[PDB]
Design a protein around this nucleic acid. Structure first.
Length: 192
DNA sequence: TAACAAAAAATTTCCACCAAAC
DNA sequence: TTTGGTGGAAATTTTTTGTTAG
């Protein structure tokens, strides 16, 4: 399937090697505590630990790195050019997908207006509740069915609601893009 | 970032149809 | 073209608590 799935993973360095070893010991002694607080406590105990003790985890990491080197080397040597390329592409895709979802999260955090609703959207938003069907997919099928067999006279209401929201969008966007300059985020602005 | 855990919280998905912005 | 919008239940991903180092 995916080259990346069978690709050997990095050995854990000192703190994760400690965290992994400690988490059970802490979870047993505090079973009603959230994982998150146990991790905060485990890190605390890491920070407090002597350098001589820390080094033992490090020494183990370093030794496992040499096994990793060996495994990964052996892995990549056994791969065909086309497999190496899927691996490189799989990694590129991994990055894009991450870059893309964080920008999306950013925009939400900056409260960017929602797109204008189409006449069709306005129709789903009001006809879906009483639609025929069990699953939300089947229910959409009936609202799709009723929308396509609707006359231009009948659509006319949704046309005006979709028109009013197009003005809403225009207005919300004018304010938000203004506010985005005042904070120094003119990158966030539309070209067209 | 990618390495560990692990379950909460956030986001996509499934179906279609539609439109703004690139 | 891509993206995100109408619906919500279920599936799936990201985040939450941390440090390390290639």
């Amino acid at each position: 399937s995916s080259v990346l799935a069978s690709c050997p993973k990095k050995p854990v360095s000192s703190y994760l090697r400690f965290s992994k070893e400690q988490l059970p010991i802490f979870k047993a002694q505090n079973p009603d505590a959230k994982t998150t607080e146990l991790i905060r406590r485990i890190a605390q105990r890491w920070r407090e630990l002597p350098d001589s003790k820390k080094k033992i985890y490090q020494d183990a990491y370093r030794a496992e790195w040499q096994v990793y080197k060996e495994e990964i080397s052996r892995f990549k040597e056994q791969l065909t050019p086309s497999q190496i390329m899927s691996l490189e592409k799989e990694i590129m895709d991994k990055h894009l997908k991450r870059k893309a979802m964080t920008k999306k999260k950013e925009l939400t955090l900056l409260g960017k207006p929602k797109r204008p609703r189409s006449a069709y959207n306005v129709y789903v938003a009001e006809r879906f509740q009483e639609a025929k069907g069990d699953s939300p997919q089947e229910k959409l099928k009936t609202v799709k069915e009723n929308w396509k067999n609707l006359s231009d006279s009948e659509k006319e209401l949704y046309i005006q609601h979709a028109k009013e929201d197009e003005t809403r969008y225009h207005n919300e966007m004018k304010s938000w893009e203004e506010q985005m300059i005042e904070v120094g985020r003119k990158d966030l602005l539309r070209r067209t």
